């Protein structure tokens, strides 16, 4: 089996970079802090034991209020008068850094005004090994540079705002099949410990890890653990990512939490390098912690060395104040677990005062604006044979699919969106928010013809072929909306358990499509989707005139796909994956049996980096539309390449901070009422055997304990690391590319220029995407687009070398519309 | 076996008061006519032969297109780029004979654009005696003041739009089982011929009959015979009905019409006073008429008169040019049978040129505007806690229940309306029309909210209880949705065939309005509905803080309401029936099963006048909500009644007849045209009158099937309560002149509707009915003398006896007020004669 080699010790913060500020602030508080105080600071307090879906005790001497941590990657889960954005594929689908940004803001905003102090999102993990993942949707794209761009946009907008965010997961979580045990049980699968993804060194650098590697260079102040193991080492105690390639390779300043329930040990676990357990408890309400209690006492009794439980607490400590959430702190002014405006104070044991739970504060303000308008910048239009955009002139207008229309349980009505029914404008499970409203396709159509005085209807059940076969007779266009949904694991729909168990439309929707196209002559389609679906039965029939995936675009999804059908804006968005004729085009199989008896599953990511676009190329496989496809308004031309060359080896030693006396310092105080479920810092006495309660308190501890994890003398910088992100050398520019971009068609528009490069060497992808932008010209106009190629950009993992080469192969750049449409290009000259 | 009794012979047209100008005309074109012309005009040419639901051939020789008569009452049938009217129930919720003239302009002008001749409409038979009936909807109210008045300015915007109006169904057709023998069957009873009202004299005169009087006096150009029997004589051959009522007490000038399949005889029909066959067969394409071919050879072999085909060709054409509709000819520009473009000529058989059947003309101009403005007036507030209008500052709206909704098969999607599925805005069967869109509650709800940057959401499956609880309680209102469905009888939704089963909410109503209530202190309860619904459990729930009944408003539903619901209209409209406690206060039972073996099924309407209002008040039964009953987001105060006394031929001519008739080889088949499959003609296949006819009963005992008098073209008696228009016209004097100040005693302007009834007196009179009554726009604070007067025959009851309107010897009051229950003023009449 796989195997996860050792890292340690775990890596203490140092102020780098960016973080010198509020690393140096972290260390004056932390200084101040009792060990019980820093142990408050690392555990949740157990689940729905308060008001956020994650939360800690705080440090009330010191006046820290205790840390919320909500969901989601969209928008606030569980709350009240929230907005609910476009889901992370959209932001993916607009390649605009500017909205990524735009959008983190305006969401950081809203959790900053509910008493939110940490966001769980964005996501970058999964990538989208396989195009039927369950939660690709809520990350970016497949592509790496693509996506760690529009991360690091997302996370900064969200931490400009005063919230944390959190890069999650972290890392190698491509399937929610057999994620966790309990989940696998509950769906008929004995397993003994959860799914191991098995990656070799090369791969995780040049692909999951880059994103990551961008997040933490943006100043990400939080990461997220994962519910899988890697190499049979589970993500949140694996000292290889954490210690070795997060902390040490990329420099990572901030804190790692857990994700709920990927806490599986104690001290295991604090020294491969987590820093946060949430949420809080082993397993849900059951009043015990791996910490808490038991890591309080492991630093008593020398287990776990104190410069290891400073450092969690200086991470902490130092994210908040790098965001300045001090500055904004207020308690959460909303329960997650109740809109009841009293409650008692600690919802799960129903215990504490009986007090106000909810404020109802409404944060919304204007963004529904950003979210109109990045739901509008996301519709991709894949096909347009001359039938958009429409005019309002059209004398009789069909609107065709359940996917048009209400959800009749109303738009929050399945619990975490847990259902297909009516428009798809959220995916499910925890990357969800409750929708303030949500404007339908019908609602917005309708409307917009009635404003003309034309005729109009709207069919939305997908059965009824009778009666869309007689409308689409009489109508001068038929738009026909199909969806294809997935979600986070722990929920169902139809059997699809989390994951997709298919890539084609739901609801007969490649049937409604063809009733319509053998009767109407102007039949467009509209897919709402977590992702590509087959399009080949249909998308070339002669009377399918255009066609738009609009993705998941949250609040005001008919506003926004409106704006695109009647041309108040003209299209920008590009595929951000591939869209193949069969499932088997993208390989990358979901593990759906077990395969290693009732062990952990072992998922071999045995393609290497060949995911999506890069092996749709390497098997010379035609995609329909290609990455970075996407049709416009107008057009553009792309000429005139010109391509121009451009002209700490230890740590100090582990600090400690403050200072531990005995057990009976850490004894529950007498005054204090222990709330049923609530996790706290304290011994019930100070025989640390008995108040731990741990079966192996005490036990082959040394065996356990893995060589030099309690290691605080100075250690080597890796070759590779040394700065945020890493080694600042691979951030040198070495190449300038520009290129005239000039708008030939007749409507201001976007283009989104892509630059490929072609590393070259045996096993390197063919072309891989490195820089883009998006670049609004009016009719005639044109700009000259110049980016830079960084040392990174044109290197690659050396596994021998543990570290960016930049190999002697020669290398050829690319630019053009999309990864398919490249008409410049030119060999580079060598760089090192 | 109630029995009615003949009258004959069947009155002839004499250019009675306005008529004077279009009958001139009638007689110096049908003058120039042969028989066989003249029977073309008198018979429809087969169902689904040409393009309209009812078509006749007309004269080609003399340039008269054939008539294309099309329903509804509402809006265009079975066409397309029409307008979908609300209701002829809202036109009465409305009280206002201003918005029911110019809907009538509406449909006329969009009817008439699209090349109809007649539309089919409007209805005031069913009046409403059963509050379960299946179509009352399509007419006005069970009262007939309220719906004699609103159906006479329907029929006068229709026809000064330039279309002849149809007043239907004439009558006593009150229900909707047991109404044609083979619809029966098919819901499996076998009865020998239809249902039959048995009514007495007084009654029809003061209750069903009273609206057609208006209808006529306002010059209607058709009326449509109906499907029942009337004292087991069929509705399209009883001489008593059509002759005696109609045409000589009434003076009726225009055409009588068959409803379609309502045509059971040649020869008894002809003489018993119909004039016009729909759709012309004996049965849907049976290639058989009781007509054309056959009332050729009728007048050929001496048993129908000349001068009574001659009278009912005059009376066709009369109706056609009184509405000038020579004047706007143009052949009809859609099919009703298709869509397509182009067809066959003749759609039933597919023969005939292959050529263009459909223009697509769009011709609802700004109709809309009326729609909404039509709907938003006839929203009948039937409680307001202080909880309406809305402001916009409502921070979260629950939108509840399916009749908020779209339906998810389109809002045509069901065949003549035939489903209850998503917002009711129209009730199914003939009296329908195509939407060009359906605006819903929740669309113009949700916009409403979004424009004031509120949260709002609508959850519209009614058994979806556990997300509308959780919904209800985090909401600052909760505005539930509910209707009740029915239509005409050929099409049943859920076992409820045409008549409804129960006055019971459907779609579980009742259940989703106190899962709302129980959770949410300020639950809003609006109805779509045909008619009453039971409101006993729920109305009076502490946190049912608002109910209002909008009808059926047609294809801008959601942007009335959401008028209402923001103040931006206050609404005026007042209930038109009774709002009872439960289906046993309102009497008057439907006849459910078989009563009289395999033979028609007998509805005796024991009751007399005593239907809805009349019947509670007579029972001294409370309704929850009472006739006349609606709120407004102002008050009124009514003071200062007053009263003020204010200050014919007794023969007919002889029966004319106009042109000549010939030999039958005059009236073979022409030798050079092509006879189309089903089509109905007036030829004969030979001059041998028996073989020509096929009839099974030609010739047999003609003389004995032939009614005495039934042949007599000679001078006739006038009635004692004939000799006018809608009757003598001595009972159109004033005699009475009221008035009462009303004033707008709150804060915002509204419309008040103060209502006149009178006592009549006698022990076996109502205690009071419905006379007069007006819709007043006021200002905050203004105040104005609503003046209106009593005619002779609003003091007047039917006197069997002398056949005759009396104004009794009893004492008569007058009462003034907001509703049938709410009359503050109340003053003595003084004799008058
Ligand atoms: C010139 O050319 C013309 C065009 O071709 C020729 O016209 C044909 O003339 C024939 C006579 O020669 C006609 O045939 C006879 O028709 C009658 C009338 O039938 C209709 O009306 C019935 C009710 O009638 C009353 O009311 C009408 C007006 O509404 C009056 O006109 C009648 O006089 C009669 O009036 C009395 O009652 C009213 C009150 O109700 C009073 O106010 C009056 O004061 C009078 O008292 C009605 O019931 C009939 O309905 C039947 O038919 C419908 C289908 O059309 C169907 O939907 C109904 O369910 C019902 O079906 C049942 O009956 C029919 C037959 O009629 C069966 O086939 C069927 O299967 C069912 O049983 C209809 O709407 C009709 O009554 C005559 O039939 C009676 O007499 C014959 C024998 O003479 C019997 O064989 C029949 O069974 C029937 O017997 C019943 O009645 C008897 C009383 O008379 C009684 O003794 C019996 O006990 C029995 O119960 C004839 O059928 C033919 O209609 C007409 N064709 C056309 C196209 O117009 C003309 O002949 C020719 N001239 C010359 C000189 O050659
Ligand atoms: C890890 O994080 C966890 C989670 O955040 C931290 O746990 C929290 O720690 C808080 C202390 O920082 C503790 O706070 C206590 O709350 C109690 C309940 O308060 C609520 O109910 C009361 C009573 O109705 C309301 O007044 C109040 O507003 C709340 O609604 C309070 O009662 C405690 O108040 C006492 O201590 C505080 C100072 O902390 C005084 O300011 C206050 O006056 C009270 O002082 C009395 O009691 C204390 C000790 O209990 C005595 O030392 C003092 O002399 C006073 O004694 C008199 O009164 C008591 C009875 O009232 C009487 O017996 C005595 O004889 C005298 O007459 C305090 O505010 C949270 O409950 C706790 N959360 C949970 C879930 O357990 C934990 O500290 C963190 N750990 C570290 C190491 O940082
Ligand atoms: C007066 O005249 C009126 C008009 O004719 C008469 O009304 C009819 O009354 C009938 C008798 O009540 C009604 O027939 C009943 O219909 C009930 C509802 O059927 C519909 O709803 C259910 C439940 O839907 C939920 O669950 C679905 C499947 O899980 C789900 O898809 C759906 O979205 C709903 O979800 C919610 O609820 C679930 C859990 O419940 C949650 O998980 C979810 O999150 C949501 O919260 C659905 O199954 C069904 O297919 C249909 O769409 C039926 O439930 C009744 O059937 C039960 O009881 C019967 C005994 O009565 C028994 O045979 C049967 O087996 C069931 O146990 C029943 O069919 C009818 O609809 C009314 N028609 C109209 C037009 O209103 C009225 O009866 C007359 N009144 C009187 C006094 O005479
Ligand atoms: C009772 O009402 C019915 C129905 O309205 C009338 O029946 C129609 O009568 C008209 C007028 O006579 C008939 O019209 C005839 O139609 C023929 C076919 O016309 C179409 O197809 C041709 C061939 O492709 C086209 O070229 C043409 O434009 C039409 O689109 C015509 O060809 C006839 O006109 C000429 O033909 C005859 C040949 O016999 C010659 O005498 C002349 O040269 C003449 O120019 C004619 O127009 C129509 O077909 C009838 N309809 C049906 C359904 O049968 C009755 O006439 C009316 N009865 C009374 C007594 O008024
Ligand atoms: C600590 O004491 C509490 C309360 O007495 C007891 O419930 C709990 O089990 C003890 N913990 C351990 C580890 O024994
Ligand atoms: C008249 O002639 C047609 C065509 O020959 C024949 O089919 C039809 O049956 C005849 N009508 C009658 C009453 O015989
Ligand atoms: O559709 C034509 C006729 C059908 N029977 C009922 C009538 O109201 C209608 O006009
Ligand atoms: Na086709
Ligand atoms: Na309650």
């Given at each position: 089996?796989?195997?996860?080699?050792?890292f340690?010790?775990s890596?203490?913060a140092?102020?780098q970079?960016?973080?010198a500020?509020?690393?140096?602030?972290?260390?004056?508080?932390?200084?101040?802090?009792?060990?019980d105080?820093?142990?408050?600071?690392?555990?949740?307090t157990?689940?729905?034991?308060?008001?956020?879906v994650?939360?800690?005790?705080?440090?009330?001497?010191?006046?820290?209020?205790?840390?919320?941590?909500?969901?989601?990657?969209?928008?606030?889960?569980?709350?009240?008068?929230?907005?609910?954005?476009?889901?992370?594929?959209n932001?993916?689908?607009?390649?605009?850094?500017?909205?990524?940004?735009?959008?983190?803001?305006?969401?950081?905003?809203?959790?900053?005004?509910?008493?939110?102090?940490?966001?769980?999102?964005?996501?970058?993990?999964?990538l989208?090994?396989?195009?039927?993942?369950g939660?690709?949707?809520?990350?970016?794209?497949?592509?790496?540079?693509?996506?760690?761009?529009?991360?690091?946009?997302?996370?900064?907008?969200?931490?400009?705002?005063?919230?944390?965010?959190?890069?999650?997961?972290?890392?190698?979580?491509?399937?929610?099949?057999?994620?966790?045990?309990?989940?696998?049980?509950?769906?008929?699968?004995?397993?003994?410990?959860?799914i191991?993804?098995?990656?070799?060194?090369?791969?995780?650098?040049?692909?999951?890890?880059?994103?990551?590697?961008?997040?933490?260079?943006?100043?990400?102040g939080a990461?997220?653990?994962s519910?899988?193991?890697?190499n049979?080492?589970?993500?949140?105690?694996?000292?290889?990512?954490?210690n070795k390639?997060?902390?040490?390779?990329?420099?990572f300043?901030?804190?790692?939490m857990?994700?709920?329930?990927?806490?599986?040990?104690?001290?295991?676990?604090?020294?491969?390098?987590?820093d946060?357990?949430?949420?809080?408890?082993?397993?849900?309400?059951?009043?015990?912690?791996?910490?808490?209690?038991?890591?309080?006492?492991?630093?008593?009794?020398?287990?776990?060395?104190?410069?290891?439980?400073?450092?969690?607490?200086?991470?902490?400590?130092?994210?908040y104040?790098?965001?300045?959430?001090?500055?904004?702190?207020?308690?959460?002014?909303?329960?997650?677990?109740?809109?009841?405006?009293?409650?008692?104070?600690?919802?799960?044991?129903?215990?504490?005062?009986?007090?106000?739970?909810?404020?109802?504060?409404?944060?919304?303000?204007?963004h529904?604006?950003?979210?109109?308008?990045?739901?509008?910048?996301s519709?991709?239009?894949?096909?347009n044979?001359?039938?958009?955009?429409?005019?309002?002139?059209?004398?009789?207008?069909?609107?065709?699919?359940?996917?048009?229309?209400?959800?009749?349980?109303?738009?929050?009505?399945?619990?975490?969106?847990?259902?297909?029914?009516?428009?798809?404008?959220?995916?499910?499970?925890?990357?969800?928010?409750?929708?303030?409203?949500?404007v339908?396709?019908?609602?917005?159509?309708?409307?917009?013809?009635?404003?003309?005085?034309?005729?109009?209807?709207?069919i939305?059940?997908?059965?009824?072929?009778?009666?869309?076969?007689?409308?689409?007779?009489?109508?001068?266009?038929?738009?026909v909306?199909?969806?294809?949904?997935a979600?986070?694991?722990?929920?169902?729909?139809?059997?699809?358990e989390?994951?997709?168990?298919?890539?084609?439309?739901?609801?007969?929707?490649?049937?409604?499509?063809?009733?319509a196209?053998?009767?109407?002559?102007?039949?467009?389609?509209?897919?709402?989707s977590?992702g590509?679906?087959?399009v080949?039965e249909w998308?070339?029939?002669?009377?399918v005139?255009?066609?738009?995936?609009?993705?998941?675009?949250?609040?005001?999804?008919?506003?926004?796909?409106?704006?695109?059908?009647?041309?108040?804006?003209?299209?920008?968005?590009?595929?951000?994956?591939?869209?193949?004729?069969?499932?088997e085009?993208?390989?990358?199989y979901?593990?759906?049996?077990?395969?290693?008896?009732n062990?952990?599953?072992q998922?071999?990511?045995?393609?290497?980096?060949?995911?999506?676009?890069?092996?749709?190329?390497?098997?010379?496989?035609?995609?329909?539309?290609?990455?970075?496809?996407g049709?416009?308004?107008?057009?553009?031309?792309?000429?005139?390449?010109?391509?121009?060359?451009?002209?700490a080896?230890?740590?100090?030693?582990?600090?400690?901070?403050?200072?531990?006396?005995?057990?009976?310092?850490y004894?529950?105080?007498?005054?204090?009422?222990?709330?049923?479920?609530?996790?706290?810092?304290?011994?019930?006495?100070?025989?640390?055997?008995?108040?731990?309660?741990?079966?192996?308190?005490?036990?082959?501890?040394?065996?356990?304990?893995?060589?030099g994890?309690?290691?605080?003398?100075?250690?080597?910088?890796?070759?590779?690391?040394?700065?945020?992100?890493?080694?600042?050398?691979?951030?040198?520019?070495?190449?300038?590319?520009?290129?005239?971009?000039?708008?030939?068609?007749?409507?201001?528009?976007?283009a989104?220029?892509?630059?490929?490069?072609?590393?070259?060497?045996?096993?390197?992808?063919?072309?891989?995407?490195?820089?883009?932008?998006?670049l609004?010209?009016?009719?005639?106009?044109?700009?000259?687009?110049?980016?830079?190629?960084?040392?990174?950009?044109?290197?690659?993992?050396?596994?021998?070398?543990?570290?960016?080469?930049?190999?002697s192969?020669?290398?050829?750049?690319?630019?053009?519309?999309?990864?398919?449409?490249?008409?410049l290009?030119?060999a580079?000259?060598?760089?090192?």
């Amino acid at each position: 089996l796989a195997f996860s080699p050792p890292f340690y010790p775990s890596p203490w913060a140092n102020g780098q970079g960016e973080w010198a500020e509020a690393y140096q602030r972290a260390v004056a508080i932390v200084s101040q802090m009792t060990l019980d105080e820093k142990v408050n600071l690392t555990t949740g307090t157990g689940w729905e034991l308060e008001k956020c879906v994650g939360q800690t005790g705080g440090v009330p001497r010191l006046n820290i209020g205790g840390m919320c941590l909500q969901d989601s990657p969209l928008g606030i889960r569980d709350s009240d008068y929230n907005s609910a954005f476009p889901a992370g594929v959209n932001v993916a689908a607009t390649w605009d850094k500017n909205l990524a940004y735009l959008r983190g803001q305006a969401m950081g905003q809203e959790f900053s005004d509910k008493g939110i102090d940490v966001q769980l999102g964005p996501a970058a993990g999964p990538l989208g090994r396989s195009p039927d993942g369950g939660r690709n949707w809520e990350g970016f794209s497949p592509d790496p540079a693509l996506t760690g761009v529009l991360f690091a946009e997302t996370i900064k907008g969200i931490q400009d705002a005063g919230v944390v965010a959190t890069a999650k997961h972290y890392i190698l979580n491509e399937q929610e099949h057999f994620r966790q045990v309990a989940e696998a049980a509950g769906y008929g699968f004995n397993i003994s410990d959860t799914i191991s993804s098995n990656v070799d060194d090369k791969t995780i650098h040049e692909m999951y890890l880059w994103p990551f590697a961008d997040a933490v260079r943006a100043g990400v102040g939080a990461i997220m653990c994962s519910y899988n193991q890697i190499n049979n080492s589970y993500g949140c105690q694996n000292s290889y990512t954490l210690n070795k390639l997060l902390k040490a390779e990329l420099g990572f300043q901030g804190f790692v939490m857990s994700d709920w329930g990927a806490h599986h040990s104690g001290v295991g676990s604090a020294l491969a390098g987590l820093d946060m357990s949430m949420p809080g408890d082993i397993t849900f309400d059951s009043a015990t912690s791996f910490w808490g209690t038991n890591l309080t006492i492991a630093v008593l009794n020398g287990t776990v060395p104190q410069w290891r439980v400073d450092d969690m607490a200086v991470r902490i400590m130092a994210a908040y104040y790098k965001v300045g959430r001090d500055r904004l702190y207020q308690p959460p002014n909303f329960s997650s677990w109740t809109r009841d405006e009293y409650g008692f104070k600690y919802f799960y044991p129903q215990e504490g005062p009986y007090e106000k739970v909810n404020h109802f504060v409404n944060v919304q303000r204007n963004h529904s604006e950003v979210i109109r308008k990045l739901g509008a910048d996301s519709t991709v239009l894949l096909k347009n044979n001359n039938a958009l955009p429409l005019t309002g002139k059209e004398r009789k207008v069909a609107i065709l699919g359940e996917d048009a229309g209400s959800n009749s349980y109303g738009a929050n009505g399945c619990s975490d969106r847990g259902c297909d029914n009516g428009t798809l404008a959220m995916a499910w499970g925890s990357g969800t928010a409750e929708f303030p409203y949500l404007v339908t396709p019908e609602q917005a159509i309708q409307a917009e013809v009635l404003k003309h005085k034309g005729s109009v209807y709207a069919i939305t059940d997908n059965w009824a072929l009778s009666q869309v076969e007689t409308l689409a007779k009489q109508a001068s266009v038929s738009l026909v909306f199909v969806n294809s949904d997935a979600g986070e694991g722990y929920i169902s729909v139809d059997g699809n358990e989390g994951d997709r168990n298919n890539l084609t439309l739901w609801k007969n929707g490649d049937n409604l499509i063809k009733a319509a196209a053998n009767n109407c002559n102007n039949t467009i389609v509209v897919i709402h989707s977590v992702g590509p679906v087959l399009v080949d039965e249909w998308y070339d029939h002669p009377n399918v005139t255009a066609i738009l995936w609009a993705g998941l675009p949250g609040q005001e999804s008919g506003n926004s796909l409106a704006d695109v059908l009647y041309g108040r804006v003209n299209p920008g968005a590009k595929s951000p994956f591939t869209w193949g004729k069969t499932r088997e085009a993208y390989g990358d199989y979901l593990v759906r049996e077990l395969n290693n008896g009732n062990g952990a599953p072992q998922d071999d990511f045995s393609e290497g980096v060949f995911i999506d676009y890069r092996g749709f190329d390497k098997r010379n496989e035609t995609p329909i539309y290609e990455f970075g496809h996407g049709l416009s308004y107008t057009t553009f031309n792309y000429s005139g390449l010109h391509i121009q060359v451009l002209n700490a080896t230890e740590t100090g030693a582990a600090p400690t901070f403050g200072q531990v006396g005995n057990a009976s310092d850490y004894v529950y105080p007498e005054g204090l009422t222990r709330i049923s479920k609530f996790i706290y810092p304290w011994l019930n006495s100070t025989d640390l055997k008995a108040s731990s309660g741990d079966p192996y308190y005490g036990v082959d501890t040394a065996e356990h304990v893995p060589e030099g994890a309690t290691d605080g003398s100075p250690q080597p910088v890796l070759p590779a690391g040394g700065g945020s992100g890493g080694n600042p050398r691979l951030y040198d520019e070495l190449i300038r590319v520009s290129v005239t971009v000039k708008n030939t068609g007749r409507v201001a528009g976007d283009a989104v220029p892509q630059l490929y490069v072609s590393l070259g060497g045996p096993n390197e992808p063919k072309v891989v995407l490195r820089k883009f932008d998006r670049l609004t010209l009016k009719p005639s106009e044109e700009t000259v687009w110049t980016t830079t190629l960084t040392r990174r950009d044109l290197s690659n993992w050396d596994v021998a070398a543990q570290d960016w080469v930049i190999t002697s192969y020669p290398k050829k750049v690319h630019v053009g519309s999309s990864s398919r449409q490249l008409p410049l290009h030119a060999a580079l000259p060598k760089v090192q």
